[PDB]
C-alpha cells in the first residue's frame, strides 16, 4: 500500500535498541518501516512546498531595439554626443571611423561617431530566492491494512522547519512520532527558483549571478533600468564606414541548452511547489499498537482474486477475499516449504494481518517476503487452506549484492547522509558520518563543479596515474580518488 | 526562581542567525502568569533532551503580566544541527539550525 | 506625560503658507524626533514628514518634496512645518509625532516602533 | 504606494475581525515595518501595534497582528463593541518615507 511496486522502496528494521530508527525519506522513494512488535508503516516525500519567495534580478532572454540615432563629428572635434544618450534607454559604443574627403570633414583622419539605439526588452526570465526557512515538507504515510485498492490508515504529515517535530493520529495504531529536519536537506539558500517562460526550476547562486544577459536588478515595474544591456546586442562597422547595430534575438533555447545541471520545479503560484527533495527525519515508533493482536482468527474459506505478484524488491503482495466467517478476524497468512508442516519460514511484511469483516467484503491484501527458494505461500486455516506456488527465484548472496550496488546509489546521492540513513544506536556510524564527512567535503571542495565527462575522464587520469609508477601509497590514493570519480559516473547512469 | 513558568509558546518570528554565531529567538508564552521564568534548551536528541551549546543570554525570563510578552534570546547552537527548544515539558514549539562549520 | 500641542483651528487663503507650531511637552526633546502627518476628514492619511531633530536634518516626501520647508529649535523645544504655496486641496489636519532617534544622534532607520504619540492636531483650511 | 487597505467591515461582539493590508516588495514584504493605528474621529490616532505581532503596553491585548508576503493582519477577538476607530496601515518603505494605508472604517453594527 501507498509505497508497494516503487522501484526506489527501501525496507528498515530495527533491532529493539528502544524505538529509535531514523529514515532519510527521499521524494521518489517510500521508505517501508517494519518491527519486532508494532504494524509497519510506508512514508513517502510527497510534495515540498517552498512558501514564501522574494525577486532577485530578472534579465531579459529576448531584445528588441528602436530607433537609431547617429551624431557624427569630422576628424577634427573628436567624440560625438547624440543626446539620446546619456539615458537608462539607449545603449552607445563610439567606433572611429572612415570619412576623409568626398563627405564633410575638411581633413582625413576618420572621425567617431557614436551610433546608439533604444533597447527595450519582450520577455522576463525573473529569478526568485528562497531561503531554507518556511519552506514546507509534507510527507504522507500508510500502514498496511485489509485495505486492497479501495482513514484509520494513512496520515497527512507536514513539516516545516518552524515545527520540526510531527506526531501523527492514528486510530488504534499509534502516533508514529516524526522529528523530521526540514533544513539541511538539499542546500538551499543556494538554490535559486528560476522563471523562463511559464516555466520554473531550481539552479545555483554561482550559475544564476554568472549568466551575461542585462540585468533588472531586482526592480520593480516602472521602465526598468538595465544593466549591461551591451552583452545582448551586436555593434559592426561594415568595412570602415556607416556602423550598425543588430538585436540578436531571443536566447530562451541557449540558457535552456546552457541549464542542462538543474533540476525542474513543477509549479508558481503563492507557492513554489517543487519536487525531489532530500530530507532526513528521526523516526520514532514510542505509540503505536497492533490491534488486531486481540481478535479472534477465523476458519473459511479463502479465494485469491489477483493471482499474487512478485515486486521487484521482491515482496509479495497477495490478495485474498473470503466469505463465510464474521467478526473482525485475523488470517494465517505463514507462507511454508512442506504441505505437510507448515513450520512458518520467511518473514511476513503486513505484521499482524486482520479483516475490517462487515459482511462478505474481505480484500485484506497482506504481502510477504518469500524466502530464496521455492515457497507455498498457504493462507487459510484447517484442512481446505487455499495455497499458491511461488519460487522467489532471486539468490540470497545476489540480495546482499543487490542491497549494497542500491547502498551505494544511497550513498552516492545523499553524501555524507547516508551514514545514518537506518542510524540506530551504534556509534560506529557517527565515525561514518565523520569520516565521510571530511572526505566528503574535502572532496567536494578541490573537485565539485566537475561535469559529466570532466569526472569520467579525470577519473581515468587518475587511474592511469593508479597504476603508473613509484610507491603503493600516494599511487594508492590517486586510484581511490579515481575509483570514487568513476564510480560517482556510473551511478546514476539511469 | 520564578518557578519554571509554564504554559504554550508560540514563536512570533521564525528565529534568525546571525554572523557572529548565534541564534535569537521571540516567543510569545500564551498568557499566563505576571513575572515567571521559562527555560529553553539547544537538543541534538528527540525533540529534547540533553542541553547542548550554550546560552549567550542568561536567566530567560518573562516580564509581566497580559498574554504574550517576547523573550528574545541569544543563543548560539552547537557546530551541527540541533533543535531548539522553547521549554514546556510537554507543549512546546521547536526548530532546525544547522550551524555551520 | 508625554505632550505635544500645537496651533489651534486655522484657516488660509489659496496660495497663502500655514506654519504649524509643535511643542513637545513631558519627554525630553534629546533622541528627538518628529514628523508631519496630514489629514483631512474622508480619505488616505499621507505623510508628508522630515525626519530629524538633532542635527536639523529633513526628509520630505516627492509629494511635497519642495513645498513645506521646517524649522527646528531646542531653546522652545519646538519643530515649525511651514507648508507654502497650498491650494484648495490642502484643506487638512497636520498632526505632529515622534519616532525616537538611534542614540547616535544620527536618524536612518527608526524605532521598531514609529508614532507612540501624536500632536494635538491643527485644522487648517482653504477658500 | 498609499497602502492597499479595505474601506469597511462588522460583527458580534466577541467575535474575531481581520483586517488585511497589502503592500507591495518595497515595503510590507521586505520588512517588518507595520503599524495599525486606531484614530478615533474628532481626536488624535494612537498605537496598537509595533513591529507587528508585539503591543505597546497601553493596549488591550485583544488585538494580534501578523503578516505572509505582503499582507497586514490587525485580528481582533473578543470584542468589547466600543472599538471602531478608524484603523490606518502605515509602514515604512524600502525608500526612506512612510505610507498610510487606505483605511478600515470599522463597523461596529
Known amino acids: 500500500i501507498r509505497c508497494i511496486g516503487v522501484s526506489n522502496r527501501d525496507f528498515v528494521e530495527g533491532m529493539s535498541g528502544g524505538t529509535w530508527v531514523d529514515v532519510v525519506l527521499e521524494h521518489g522513494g517510500c521508505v517501508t518501516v517494519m518491527a519486532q512488535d508494532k504494524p509497519t508503516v510506508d512514508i513517502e516525500l510527497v510534495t515540498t512546498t517552498v512558501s514564501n519567495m522574494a525577486e532577485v534580478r530578472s534579465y531579459c532572454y529576448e531584445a528588441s531595439i528602436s530607433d537609431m540615432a547617429s551624431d557624427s563629428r569630422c576628424p577634427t572635434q573628436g567624440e560625438a554626443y547624440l543626446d539620446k544618450q546619456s539615458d537608462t534607454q539607449y545603449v552607445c559604443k563610439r567606433t572611429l571611423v572612415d570619412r576623409g574627403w568626398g563627405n564633410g570633414c575638411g581633413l582625413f583622419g576618420k572621425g567617431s561617431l557614436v551610433t546608439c539605439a533604444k533597447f527595450a526588452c519582450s520577455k522576463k526570465m525573473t529569478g526568485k530566492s528562497i531561503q531554507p526557512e518556511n519552506l514546507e515538507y509534507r510527507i504522507m504515510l500508510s500502514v498496511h491494512g485489509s485495505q486492497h485498492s479501495g482513514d484509520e490508515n494513512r496520515a497527512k504529515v507536514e513539516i516545516t522547519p518552524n515545527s520540526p517535530r510531527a506526531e501523527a493520529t492514528l486510530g488504534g495504531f499509534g502516533s508514529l512520532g516524526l522529528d523530521c529536519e526540514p533544513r539541511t536537506g538539499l542546500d538551499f539558500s543556494d538554490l535559486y527558483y528560476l522563471t523562463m517562460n511559464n516555466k520554473h526550476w531550481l539552479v545555483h547562486k554561482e550559475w544564476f549571478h554568472d549568466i551575461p544577459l542585462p540585468w533588472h536588478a531586482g526592480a520593480d515595474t516602472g521602465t526598468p533600468h538595465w544593466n549591461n544591456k551591451e552583452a545582448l546586442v551586436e555593434f559592426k562597422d561594415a568595412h570602415a564606414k556607416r556602423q550598425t547595430v543588430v538585436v540578436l534575438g531571443s536566447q530562451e533555447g541557449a540558457v535552456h541548452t546552457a541549464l542542462a545541471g538543474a533540476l525542474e520545479a513543477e509549479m508558481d503560484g503563492a507557492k513554489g511547489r517543487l519536487s525531489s527533495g532530500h530530507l532526513k527525519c528521526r523516526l520514532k515508533m514510542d505509540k503505536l499498537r497492533l490491534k488486531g493482536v486481540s481478535y479472534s482468527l477465523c476458519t473459511a474459506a479463502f479465494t485469491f482474486t489477483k493471482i499474487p505478484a512478485e515486486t521487484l524488491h521482491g515482496t509479495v503482495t497477495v490478495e485474498v477475499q473470503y466469505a463465510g466467517t464474521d467478526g473482525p478476524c485475523k488470517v494465517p497468512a505463514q507462507m511454508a516449504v512442506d504441505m505437510q508442516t507448515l513450520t512458518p519460514v520467511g518473514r511476513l511484511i503486513t505484521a499482524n494481518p486482520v479483516i475490517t469483516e462487515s459482511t462478505e467484503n474481505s480484500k485484506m491484501m497482506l504481502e510477504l517476503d518469500p524466502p530464496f527458494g521455492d515457497s507455498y505461500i498457504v493462507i487459510g486455516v484447517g484442512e481446505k487452506k487455499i495455497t499458491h506456488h511461488w519460487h522467489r527465484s532471486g539468490s540470497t548472496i545476489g540480495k546482499a549484492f543487490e542491497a549494497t550496488v542500491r547502498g551505494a546509489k544511497r550513498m552516492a546521492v545523499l553524501g555524507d547522509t547516508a551514514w545514518d540513513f537506518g542510524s540506530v544506536g551504534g556509534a560506529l556510524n557517527s565515525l561514518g558520518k565523520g569520516i565521510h564527512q571530511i572526505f566528503g567535503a574535502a572532496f567536494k571542495s578541490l573537485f565539485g563543479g566537475m561535469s559529466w565527462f570532466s569526472q569520467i575522464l579525470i577519473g581515468t587520469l587518475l587511474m592511469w596515474l593508479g597504476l603508473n609508477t613509484k610507491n603503493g601509497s600516494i599511487s594508492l590514493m590517486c586510484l581511490a580518488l579515481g575509483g570514487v570519480l568513476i564510480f560517482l559516473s556510473t551511478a546514476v547512469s539511469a | 526562581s520564578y518557578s519554571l513558568c509554564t504554559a504554550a509558546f508560540t514563536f512570533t518570528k521564525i528565529p534568525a542567525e546571525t554572523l557572529h554565531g548565534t541564534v535569537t529567538v521571540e516567543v510569545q508564552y500564551a498568557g499566563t502568569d505576571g513575572p515567571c521564568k521559562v527555560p529553553a534548551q539547544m537538543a541534538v536528541d528527540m525533540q529534547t533532551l540533553t542541553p547542548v551549546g550554550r546560552l549567550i543570554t542568561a536567566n530567560p525570563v518573562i516580564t509581566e503580566s497580559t498574554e504574550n510578552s517576547k523573550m528574545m534570546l541569544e543563543l548560539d547552537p552547537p557546530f551541527g544541527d540541533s533543535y531548539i527548544v522553547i521549554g514546556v515539558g510537554e507543549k512546546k514549539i521547536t526548530h532546525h539550525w544547522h550551524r555551520s562549520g | 506625560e508625554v505632550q505635544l500641542v500645537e496651533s489651534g483651528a486655522e484657516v488660509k487663503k489659496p496660495g497663502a503658507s500655514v506654519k504649524v507650531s509643535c511643542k513637545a511637552s513631558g519627554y525630553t526633546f534629546t533622541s528627538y524626533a518628529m514628523h508631519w502627518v496630514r489629514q483631512a476628514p474622508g480619505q488616505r492619511l499621507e505623510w508628508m514628514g522630515w525626519?530629524?531633530?538633532?542635527?536639523?536634518?529633513?526628509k520630505y516626501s516627492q509629494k511635497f518634496q519642495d513645498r513645506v520647508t521646517i524649522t527646528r529649535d531646542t531653546s522652545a523645544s519646538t519643530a515649525y512645518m511651514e507648508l507654502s504655496s497650498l491650494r484648495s486641496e490642502d484643506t487638512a489636519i497636520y498632526y505632529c509625532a515622534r519616532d525616537k532617534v538611534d542614540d547616535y544622534g544620527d536618524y536612518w532607520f527608526p524605532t521598531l516602533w514609529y508614532f507612540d504619540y501624536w500632536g494635538q492636531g491643527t485644522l487648517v483650511t482653504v477658500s | 504606494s498609499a497602502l492597499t487597505q479595505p474601506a469597511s467591515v462588522s460583527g458580534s461582539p466577541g467575535q474575531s475581525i481581520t483586517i488585511s493590508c497589502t503592500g507591495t516588495s518595497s515595503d510590507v514584504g521586505g520588512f517588518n515595518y507595520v503599524s495599525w493605528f486606531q484614530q478615533h474621529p474628532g481626536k488624535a490616532p494612537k498605537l496598537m501595534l509595533y513591529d507587528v505581532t508585539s503591543r505597546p503596553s497601553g493596549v488591550s491585548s485583544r488585538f494580534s497582528g501578523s503578516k505572509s508576503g505582503n499582507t497586514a493582519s490587525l485580528t481582533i477577538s473578543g470584542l468589547q463593541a466600543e472599538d471602531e476607530a478608524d484603523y490606518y496601515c502605515s509602514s515604512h518603505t524600502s525608500r526612506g518615507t512612510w505610507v498610510f494605508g487606505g483605511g478600515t472604517k470599522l463597523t461596529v453594527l
Open positions: 525626519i530629524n531633530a538633532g542635527n536639523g536634518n529633513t
